[PDB]
Amino acid sequence: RYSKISDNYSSLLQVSEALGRAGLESSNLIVGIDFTKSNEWTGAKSFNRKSLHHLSNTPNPYEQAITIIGRTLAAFDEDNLIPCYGFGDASTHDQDVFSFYPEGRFCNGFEEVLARYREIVPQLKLAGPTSFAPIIEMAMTVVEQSSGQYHVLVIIADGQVTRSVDTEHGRLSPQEQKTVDAIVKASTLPLSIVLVGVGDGPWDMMQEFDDNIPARAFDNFQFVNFTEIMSKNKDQSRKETEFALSALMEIPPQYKATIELNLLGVRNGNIPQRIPLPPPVQ
Template sequence: MILTITFTASVAAAAAAATYIYINRRPRVGKRHKSKFHEDDDAQIYVAMSSNALRCYSMSGEDLVLFDTLGEVSDAIREAGLVECQLIIGIDFTASNLTQGEMTFGGRGLHSIEANVENPYQQVIRIIGHTLAPFNETGIIRGFGFGDSETKDTSVFELDPQLHFCNGFKELLAAYNETAQRVTMSGPTNFAPLIHRAINIVRREKKYHILVIIADGQVVDEVRTRNAIVAAAMWPISIIMVGVGDGPWSMMEAFDAGLPARKFDNFHFVDFNEIIKGSNDPDYEFALNALMEIPKQYIAIKNSRLLSGSDSRDNLA
């Protein structure tokens, strides 16, 4: 499939009418342009992408934000005005994790804990935690699990119920490792309780948060999950959903491309295995793809005054 995207007139001069070619939903660029961060009058963000760019794409196709390097993403995040963020990690403990590594994890369960082999959840926690560390000065990361035999699809549990948070991604990894070996996996899968917990945290703290949901498949209650994502767009929260395991990912791709109109596009899906497959630097490329929409999301949050601290949205969450 080949898709040509033409910039709007307000940024055409700056971007020199770049043409992007999609092959299997991965962009390739025919012309080389100087990578530069642009914002038009409508607060839409565009970045020209050079011909040697890594694989990254926006499923929605509305505001295409592309970067050559992870350094450019970090620069764009800072240029957007983001100097600090809080991190929330949600981990899927549904029983499907026991079989979802058949093709992508050597037939092992996705939560398998081994001495010399990182499972996909461990990889994502480490990469995201390390990459966002410069923007998380407090080091506080809140970790939650869902889909086990106790919470099922109705609530979440804290990975560290004593402190209620972890101090850095290494502590989060330790809490995850301990939990993965003792929890009884169940289901069904529902992101709504986790998203509403994140909303409650943001309502209380009045700070920008990034919610990373790591899960192995489709949600059962699509309506509740859709409604929760829409409700979260009333708050300063970016949601990154990282799919691990064999999939399928059609619902997540549909969420990324076709959720109802919101204050801003607050949901971004990343297929972890597809991104790292065949990559010479999987950590780098995953981080790049996971964070590529943060700059435009944060600018949209600022322009919508979602960081104002107002409590007028409480009845909408």
């Protein structure tokens, strides 16, 4: 489907212009980066047995995804300010997020996101387990504090939310419970959530995860498999446009939904204020 569309898109500029014609207006971007220890081994097939957070003269999958999404959404970002958070390292585990800059200061453009990411990475201790509840709750808090301006939260991760050891008997983990609850509660705000999967996975459980999210006033969640798209044997430009479209094609409909439900521009009033930890760096 996005493959069929991308066959006509040679640049991210075209994708940006298409999003605009599709109704997307002022749109803000929040980025959350997975710093769990599994990043050390989920690059076995997709990244030459290197860590997915390996730094070098070629971008790792996190840097690549940030670049494509950032370049595509930049045109809609009026203040160019991107709240950016890490989670899953030893300072946050599955409980918190940390801001890329102290005092929760936002990054100035995706270029600063990328630069600051490279500074932070060598100082982190990767940990776990995996929950997206803190990062989704952080995004909720930012949306509320902005008085309901429309945000897209892009979570880039190398593994699904941690499951129960007794998952075979239908039991949910607290990580699953809180993450699903956060997705549902986030639908009371003008907020879209895109989960970008990098690395080997496994990601075969995501369709089912999506299907099992409880009913919401609008569908505010998308999963996109970066690795599967970028592993196709076609030109770089069209792998990039396919990924951009696969991640963002549904953003303008979702935006329109937040207007129809009168979520846009208002405070919900029921949103706990999550506080980001400082970046755990020198």
